[PDB]
Design a binder for this molecule. Structure first.
Ligand SMILES: Nc1ncnc2c1ncn2[C@@H]1O[C@H](COP(=O)(O)OP(=O)(O)O)[C@@H](O)[C@H]1O
Ligand SMILES: [Mg+2]
Length: 378
């Protein structure tokens, strides 16, 4: 019936798009960003969603929730949830077989199902769409990884219900990005979707035959992405600060919070320019942090992790029994595909083959979902 919006509900960032006047508009949040962190905090009884929540992550690790997409539709006993709980800094309890996030609210223990946190992120995406369109939004197209089972797909629809959204269709993330580049109805082609995000890495082979995408092969690394590239820069500067001033910055959380924020900005900056400056006045009492980070240094610290992304690319091609030449189209997805070195490594692997270009790679999935939303509307 009414407006239908497309939403990219990602592990680390979220993005919303609308299809109006025969084109897609990727919407800005309160801070003027087309992307919103999938973080929720409950510090001093104040619920915050997005970048305001992401900032509390270091100072308040028990009150800040994120990476809830790794728990959604799963049992506490799942092999992947056991590996994740050991990595997540906030408390995850076993609520009679189902994982629950335990936080303190008004001095009381409060438990949330993973779909309750995801719904708070969807509530923010829905509100951005409502004030932009000037109309009530109920229907939405939401994306999910191609590997997501029936439980994970339904748990996402349930997060939508809590948020007041009727998720009319759940589509695959690599199918959404290929749709964004108008690759549907290309008749007899093979598409390789290289998706490197904040926390996960996914490679998918898509085949299009009469406007219908078939997910031919998938591979990846659930613990490889952007936040890893940060940690490597983080490690380097902590080591450097220890050898210069004899102070371990890891003991001071206010110091780690300032450095973490500056490292994320510095990394982004290196995607457009070749050098950047990290300046933090009084990182600790009586010490000013001032260091240069070159694009070259950023690449040297992450080279192994960058090339590691080619291992699942080799696997999809091997599983599909494909030569490199069989790939007709390359689609880059994820905030980390903005890294000039990552683009160069994929191009070099595909012997000079240029990928598709025209959409910000962190917005391509939400762009695809809004195209799908417009098809459903008619
Ligand atoms: N300009 C950029 N250059 C490099 N990395 C970027 C840039 N923009 C975003 N990123 C990184 O992209 C990652 C998030 O990826 P994204 O695809 O948006 O989310 P998700 O993984 O949740 O699907 C973060 O690690 C972020 O720092
Ligand atoms: Mg994504």
């Amino acid at each position: 019936e009414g407006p239908v919006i497309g939403i990219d509900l990602g592990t680390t960032y979220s993005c919303v798009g609308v299809f109006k006047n025969g084109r897609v508009e990727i919407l800005n949040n309160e801070l003027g960003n087309r992307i919103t962190p999938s973080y929720v905090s409950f510090v001093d009884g104040e619920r915050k969603v997005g970048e305001a929540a992401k900032l509390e992550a270091t100072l308040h690790p028990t009150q800040t929730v994120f990476d809830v997409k790794r728990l959604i539709g799963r049992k506490f006993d799942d092999q992947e949830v056991v590996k994740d709980r050991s990595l997540l800094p906030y408390e995850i309890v076993n609520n009679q077989g189902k994982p629950n996030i335990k936080v303190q609210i008004k001095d009381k223990d409060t438990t949330f199902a993973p779909e309750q946190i995801s719904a708070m992120v969807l509530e923010k995406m829905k509100e951005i769409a409502q004030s932009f369109l000037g109309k009530p939004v109920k229907n939405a197209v939401v994306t999910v990884p191609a590997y997501f089972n029936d439980a994970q797909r339904q748990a996402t629809k349930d997060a939508g219900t809590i948020a007041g959204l009727n998720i009319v269709r759940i589509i695959n993330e690599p199918t959404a990005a290929a749709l964004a580049y108008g690759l549907d109805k290309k008749e007899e082609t093979s598409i390789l979707v290289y998706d490197l995000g904040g926390g996960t890495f996914d490679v998918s082979i898509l085949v299009i035959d009469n406007g219908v995408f078939e997910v031919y092969a998938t591979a990846g690394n659930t613990h490889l992405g952007g936040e890893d590239f940060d940690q490597r820069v983080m490690d380097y500067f902590i080591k450097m600060f220890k050898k210069k001033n004899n102070i371990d910055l890891r003991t001071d959380k206010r110091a780690i919070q300032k450095l973490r924020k500056e490292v994320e900005i510095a990394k982004r900056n290196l995607s457009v320019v070749h050098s950047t400056q990290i300046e933090i006045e009084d990182i600790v009492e009586g010490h000013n942090f001032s260091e240069t980070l070159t694009r070259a240094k950023f690449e040297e610290l992450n080279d192994d992790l960058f090339r590691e992304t080619l291992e699942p690319v080799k696997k999809v091609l091997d599983d599909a029994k494909y030569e490199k030449s069989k790939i007709d189209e390359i689609v880059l997805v994820g905030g980390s595909t903005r890294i000039p070195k990552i683009q160069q490594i994929i191009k070099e692997f595909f012997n000079g083959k240029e990928p598709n270009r025209g959409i910000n790679p962190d917005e391509a999935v939400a762009y695809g979902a809004a195209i799908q939303a417009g098809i459903i509307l008619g």
